[PDB]
Ligand binder design. Structure first.
Ligand SMILES: Nc1nc2c(ncn2[C@@H]2O[C@H](COP(=O)(O)OP(=O)(O)OP(=O)(O)O)[C@@H](O)[C@H]2O)c(=O)[nH]1
Ligand SMILES: [Mg+2]
Lengths: 79, 843, 73, 224, 70
RNA sequence: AAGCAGCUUUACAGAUCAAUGGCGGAGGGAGGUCAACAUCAAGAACUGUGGGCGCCUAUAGAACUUAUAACGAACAUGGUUCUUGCCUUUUACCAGAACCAUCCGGGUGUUGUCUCCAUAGAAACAGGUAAAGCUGUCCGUUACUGUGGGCUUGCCAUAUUUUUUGGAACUUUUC
């Protein structure tokens, strides 16, 4: 399915996302999955409060993701 | 700027993925990749890159109607006139290509097409220091011969990942006409024989490290591929991944179930044969033999393909290709294994550490790059580089250095040049580039002037970062030149132009050694006949227009001995006594092999910087070496090992420790030359038996004194040592038919050494692989003799490996034996002849 | 099936999510889980707006779908 | 071979094409005292590598090198042996199950071998005319049957009489190839097509022999 | 399915886990699972009162996993 | 790869029997041992001319490249200028070069014919170029149904941890 391949193609670029938690994470993406797992670096979190933090490495569960936000050149990619 | 790009895009025959998304993918380091392609003669390299390019560009201007039907194989990445007229790849040329995959996630890839000829092995090394992983292409008919052995060996030594591509299977079925059961056994024999020489990793079609392709008919296979596009539709998806495992390896399925049992019941074939080989042979026999009306039904029924009657009218061959490229689509199976086989973290640190030394600091935050090849394109000359760190842009001032100046290790240390333009290599075209990103191999204009052969390139803003950075070691070429020719210009007034051209040669040709003598004659050292023939054509045509005179093919020799010393200073306060010893063959072979001593391998002497307890531990451990001598080992040479043995070493160790550097410079100076022919010395050990120094030494011991005295003592020490003259020997790889074996034998008997090392039945083909050894002075016109005498059946490759120098049977100095002039000398004295002949050139 | 879903392709859509937020933009890619990809997106949390760009939503998160405008040339 | 005035033992010999061999000089470069003498340096070497074993080559074309040395096998004696057959010249060299319905897609035919596939794979390697099923028409004197015979080796057994003929035919072939014409005429329409026109001619059919006899009487009457 | 995650590089190293209910744990990484169930040794709570325990954390719960020292 | 449904058509009974919309048609097919007239290796890019709306197409000239890929898997003669034998010279020649020609052939386009063959017709009208449904009108089925064909389709069927058989439900305070 194409909605997963687009993700794999944004590996390397910087990504923004939203979780069921309520917070948004922003950073370079290293690995993804068909599940929608993620592996990122130099993340800059921002919760409901506005509280910023730093997280060196992160793994996720896709189930917990609401939606992603992806770079602009990834609209000319082949489907 | 923008305008120049507007004229340059019109030359480029555009693309299906255009340039924007591929140029966009360059930022992420884990994205893209770099890959070289290597193999023997005519393995399908350049035609495989042909496949990737025709899957790349939508409209190529060069196609005749003939190449599109594929009667004559199209050659992309052979640009030059020599490459087309000769018929073989000469200079390496790459293609920057965005490739999708089965995962639909595309990546940029930098392909490097290396020549397959042995005389050009040097440039393959230039692709080794560049590529991250390498595709070794094997002929299913030829199988693997010694050159593949030494390719997977050099490959695994240089810390690059290996993909194996078994090519020309259509030559397996069509030419040799093997049944399925025998063809599977043949591929399996090739796989076992490629696995035998690899240590620590076993391959198998199941592990996706082996790829079955035919570049002519233009198809490519991995088992995951041919399973995914077809058998994945038919049966559920959870069973396919374990089905792939249940494909290879003796598994047999009777009806709907598989049992490893021998073949019990009746109708019996293996799974790989049943699901792959048999349907392939069916594709061929049906495409050729069957009525074209019948085939449409099998295409629609099985593969869901429909064809126009125009496709049904070609000829047997171009219709076969149209059917194969039709059924098996654009090749993402190759890109799958190329994507999987290279993981940057595990290999990369070992690969960069193998050159820049393992110590690393100042990560990222610096421009760090390595210049390998000076390429001749339509304009001028261009610099092929790999980008290890940092960002390049047009007009950037860049620091440059040379590999030898790096061997030597503030102000006066920095030559610098601006980067005028950076292209991506498009083979026949070049793509203009604003900015160069980490990991990608790019072309640059303006950097060539500061270097010859390899170069180290960096930009550093910090002092500590200047201190921590470590330069690239000089690129180790795969073969030593060894093939000697004396050029003069036909009209001496034209000497300067030739000079210029020669320098240009040394730039574009990494394996050439240009030496200027006393008389102005220009000695050129090159790998073989063909290589130096390309040298001479580019020298008379492209570069220098001067008509030139060429001498008779010759070779470089060496000096040795087989077993006391009195010496006197020009101001007789010094005395030198140095013994001369032959060396063990095991020690010689361990020195000639360049290694870090990893595993159980004997340590190379270049690691002497490690604790001499370790070096002495290696010497004593392997050779039973003398403990005192092992600890008294001083250094190695440009050449053999140097040791200090005497009591005054104990008497005045410090006074000698002041002269050690004098001895070590004047010594390299001495053995770099020689007493007989002024040629380097091979396999000769020295020990310093005595040293006598002036009294109170008032500026008395000096380099101008000790150095030429040590030099003379080494020379006459070699004279009293019963010296010998040394000749290099090619190892010969011949492929002939069985009934032609005696002829080859006589050929060997006719030349000089007549030494055949091995004779090997080539399994599955009517070919003999004959390994042998030939003197290089006799190697002239040997290939043509073999080819003519055998009426076009068979072939010869002369490769220089193990770098062995065999003794010349002639007496070393005997004025008595030599025979009249213009007569080839007798077998009894060939040493006196060669020595004298070089002597009257030296003076 | 999914015959209707292909018909929506390349139309500006109004997608309500479980959070209440509503995304808007064209539809480039579609899934069996109802993963939607959307181009030039804009949330309307509610007198509010934000510019995101390319957004990939999950199936869990999506509630309803509705065409805003016809397919663009 | 023509340009360098060095010929193959079985190839044709031409004139020099470059007049002056006259220059002969000893020198510190040339001197036989400084040159190591081994190998004959046969002329085949000068032709095989024209920029190396030959000094100052001129008007020389870059030769082809090293084709793969094809292995192809063929059986001329018994055709009863199958198309895929191992030839004597060749060196000796409980978990998961799915329904029985599926098979190899293309295997619904029992045997891949056909009566026409052996001759077909035998036509896959054939000279130009036969390997192509579609072509264009040529005049009878255009097709050259014996051209292939004198491009080959005389081998051994033949007498010198026919070998010299091989060399002569080769010489004529090389001259015919070396100097082409490539004429382009849009202007001329056939002397016969424009000739038949108007009154003085009429067109019919005749036996070939009768046409010959007519033409003979015409020639005789005209010379008389 | 069942992509065995890339936790080989964390084995036998200290960690700073976070779990559901804003509760977090330090420990040496012993072993991991398909579903990301974890084995930690020398487990210490972070309430700020740090209690030594000696533990198998469930996969579902896990939010993230960090490294204390580079 | 069967069936169902959807799509395309189809022999069609059809809604309309209007305005529509689609696909084709407003100059047939094949073959001339038929002729006339033009050209004619291919490609990027420079200059000039003409047409249509800076762009596109055609023609001419120059330079570069390809293996001069083979208008011809053929190859024959002559002239001039040079170099080789000639002693004679004429006829002819001997055997290499270069520049020219001539001759036997080929394909492509277009025009006018000839033979054999095809059934709707709307092949009807008016505009022009070097060309044509090129354009405008126009008409054949027809744009929405059911029977009959093909597929480009459903992707092929999972309630127990990463999406479609729910951790939801509910309350209260702040602005
Ligand atoms: N029969 C057969 N020959 C093949 C096939 N693929 C490649 N070849 C051989 O490869 C030759 C042409 O391939 P090239 O790519 O030009 O040669 P190459 O492999 O680049 O050789 P190098 O330039 O020396 O590396 C042909 O002469 C073929 O004999 C194949 O599928 N079948
Ligand atoms: Mg090649």
């Amino acid at each position: 399915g194409i909605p997963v391949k687009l993700l794999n193609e944004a590996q390397g670029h910087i990504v923004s996302l939203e979780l069921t938690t309520g917070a948004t994470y922003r950073g370079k993406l290293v690995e993804s999955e068909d599940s929608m797992n993620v592996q990122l670096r130099d993340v800059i979190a921002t919760e409901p409060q506005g509280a910023v933090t730093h997280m060196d490495q992160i793994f996720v569960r896709g189930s917990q993701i609401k939606f992603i936000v992806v770079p602009d050149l990834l609209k000319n990619a082949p489907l | 700027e923008h305008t120049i790009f507007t004229q340059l895009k019109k030359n480029i025959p555009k693309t299906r993925y255009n340039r924007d998304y591929m140029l966009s993918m360059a930022n992420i380091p884990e994205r893209i990749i770099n890959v070289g392609v290597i193999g023997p003669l005519h393995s399908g390299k350049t035609s495989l890159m042909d496949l990737l390019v025709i899957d790349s560009h939508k409209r190529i201007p060069d196609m005749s109607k003939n190449v599109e039907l594929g009667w004559k194989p199209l050659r992309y990445l052979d640009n030059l006139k020599q490459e087309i007229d000769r018929g073989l790849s000469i200079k390496l040329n790459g293609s920057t290509l965005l490739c999708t995959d089965l995962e639909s996630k595309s990546r940029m890839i930098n392909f490097l097409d290396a020549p397959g000829h042995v005389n050009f092995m040097d440039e393959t090394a230039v692709a080794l220091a560049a590529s991250d992983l390498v595709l070794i292409v094997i002929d299913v008919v030829e199988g693997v011969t010694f050159v593949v052995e030494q390719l997977i060996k050099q490959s695994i030594k240089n810390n690059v990942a290996m993909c194996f591509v078994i090519n020309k299977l259509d030559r397996l079925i069509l030419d040799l006409k093997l049944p399925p059961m025998d063809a599977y056994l043949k591929l399996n024999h090739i796989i076992a024989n490629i696995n035998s020489f690899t240590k620590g990793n076993v391959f198998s079609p199941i592990d996706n490290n082996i790829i079955f392709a035919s570049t002519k008919l233009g198809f490519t296979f991995t088992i995951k591929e041919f399973v995914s596009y077809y058998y994945a539709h038919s049966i559920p998806s959870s069973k396919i991944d374990d089905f792939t495992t249940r494909l290879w390896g003796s598994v047999y399925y009777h009806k709907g179930n598989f049992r490893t049992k021998p073949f019990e019941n009746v109708e019996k074939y293996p799974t790989f044969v049943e699901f792959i080989l048999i349907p392939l042979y069916k594709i061929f026999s049906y495409a050729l033999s069957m009525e074209k009306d019948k085939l449409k039904n099998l295409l629609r029924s099985n593969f869901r393909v429909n064809l126009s009657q125009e496709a049904l009218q070609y000829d047997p061959q171009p219709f076969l290709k149209h059917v194969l490229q039709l059924i098996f689509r654009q090749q993402t199976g190759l890109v799958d294994a190329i994507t999987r086989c290279y993981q940057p973290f595990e290999l990369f640190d070992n690969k960069t550490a193998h050159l820049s030394i393992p110590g690393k600091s100042t990560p990222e935050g610096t421009l760090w790059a390595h210049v390998l090849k000076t390429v001749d394109y339509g304009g001028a000359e261009w610099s092929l580089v790999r980008i290890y760190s940092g960002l390049l842009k047009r007009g950037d001032t860049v620091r440059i250095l040379d590999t030898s100046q790096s061997e030597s290790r503030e102000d006066d240390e920095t030559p610098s040049c601006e980067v005028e333009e950076i292209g991506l290599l498009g083979g026949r075209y070049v793509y203009p580039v604003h900015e160069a990103h980490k990991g990608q191999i790019v072309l640059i204009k303006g950097i060539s002037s500061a270097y010859i052969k390899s170069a180290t390139l960096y930009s550093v803003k910090s002092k500590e970062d200047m201190k921590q950075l470590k330069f690239f070691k000089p690129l180790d070429y795969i073969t030593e030149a060894v093939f000697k020719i004396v050029l003069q210009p036909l009209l001496p007034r034209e000497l300067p132009k030739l000079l210029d051209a020669l320098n240009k040669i040394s730039k574009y040709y990494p394996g050439v050694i240009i030496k200027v003598e006393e008389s102005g004659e220009h000695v050129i050292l090159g790998n073989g006949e063909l290589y130096m023939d390309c040298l001479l054509y580019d020298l008379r045509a492209s570069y220098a227009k001067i008509e030139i005179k060429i001498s008779d093919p010759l070779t470089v020799f060496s000096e040795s001995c087989s077993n006391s010393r009195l010496g006197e200073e020009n101001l007789p306060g010094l005395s030198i006594s140095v013994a001369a010893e032959p060396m063990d063959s095991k020690m010689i072979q361990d020195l000639s092999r360049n290694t870090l001593g990893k595993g159980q391998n004997c340590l190379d002497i270049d690691g002497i910087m490690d604790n001499p307890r370790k070096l002495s531990k290696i010497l004593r451990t392997e050779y039973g070496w003398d403990s005192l001598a092992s600890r008294n080992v001083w250094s190695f040479y440009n050449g053999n090992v140097l040791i200090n043995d005497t009591l005054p070493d104990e008497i005045s160790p410090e006074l000698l420790s002041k002269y050690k550097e004098q001895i070590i410079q004047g010594f390299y100076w001495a053995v770099k030359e020689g007493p007989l022919a002024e040629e380097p010395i091979y396999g000769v050990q020295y020990k310093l038996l005595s040293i006598s120094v002036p009294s109170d030494v008032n500026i008395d011991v000096m380099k101008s004194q000790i150095i030429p005295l040590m030099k003379k003592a080494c020379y006459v020490g070699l004279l009293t040592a019963i010296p010998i003259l040394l000749e290099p020997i090619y190892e010969v790889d011949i492929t002939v038919h069985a009934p032609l074996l005696p002829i080859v034998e006589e050929l060997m008997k006719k030349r000089r050494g007549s030494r055949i090392y091995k004779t090997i039945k080539v399994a599955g083909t009517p070919l003999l692989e004959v390994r042998g050894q030939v003197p290089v002075i006799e190697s002239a016109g040997f290939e043509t003799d073999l080819r003519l005498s055998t009426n076009g059946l068979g072939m010869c490759q002369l490769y220089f490996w193990h770098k062995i120098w065999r003794k010349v049977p002639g007496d070393v100095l005997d004025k008595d034996a030599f025979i009249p002039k213009l007569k080839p000398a007798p077998i009894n004295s060939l040493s006196r002849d060669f020595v004298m002949k070089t002597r009257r050139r030296k003076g | 099936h999914s015959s209707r879903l292909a018909n929506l392709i390349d139309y500006k859509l109004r997608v309500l999510t479980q959070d209440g937020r509503v995304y808007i933009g064209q539809l480039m890619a579609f899934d069996k889980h109802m993963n939607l990809v959307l181009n030039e997106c804009i949330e309307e949390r509610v007198v509010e707006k934000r510019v995101l760009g390319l957004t990939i939503l999950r199936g869990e998160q999506i509630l309803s779908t509705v065409v805003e405008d016809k397919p663009l040339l | 071979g023509k340009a360098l005035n060095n010929a193959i033992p079985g190839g044709p010999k031409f004139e020099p094409l470059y007049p002056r061999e006259e220059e002969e000089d000893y020198n510190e470069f040339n001197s036989i005292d400084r040159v190591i003498f081994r190998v004959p340096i046969r002329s085949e070497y000068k032709v095989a590598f024209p920029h190396l074993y030959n000094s100052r080559p001129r008007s020389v074309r870059i030769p082809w090198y090293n084709n793969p040395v094809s292995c192809i096998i063929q059986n001329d004696e018994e055709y009863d042996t199958p198309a895929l057959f191992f030839d004597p010249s060749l060196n000796p060299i409980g978990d998961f199950t799915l329904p029985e319905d599926f098979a190899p897609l293309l295997a619904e035919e029992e045997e891949l071998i056909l009566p026409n596939t052996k001759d077909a794979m035998s036509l896959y390697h054939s000279p130009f005319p036969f390997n192509r099923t579609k072509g264009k028409m040529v005049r009878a004197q255009d097709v050259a049957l014996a051209k292939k015979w004198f491009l080959q080796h005389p081998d051994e057994e033949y007498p010198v009489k026919v070998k010299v003929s091989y060399q002569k035919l080769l010489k004529n072939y090389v001259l015919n190839e070396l100097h082409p014409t490539l004429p382009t005429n849009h202007n001329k329409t056939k002397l016969l097509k424009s000739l038949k026109n108007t009154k003085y001619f009429q067109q019919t059919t005749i036996d070939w022999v009768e046409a010959g006899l007519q033409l003979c009487r015409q020639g005789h009457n005209m010379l008389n | 399915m069942v992509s065995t995650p890339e936790l080989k590089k964390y084995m036998d190293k200290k960690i700073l886990l976070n779990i559901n209910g804003s509760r977090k744990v330090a420990g040496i990484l012993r072993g991991y699972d398909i579903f990301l169930n974890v084995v930690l040794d020398d487990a210490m709570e972070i309430n700020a009162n740090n209690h030594q325990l000696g533990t198998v954390i469930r996969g579902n719960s896990i939010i993230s996993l960090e490294a204390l020292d580079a």
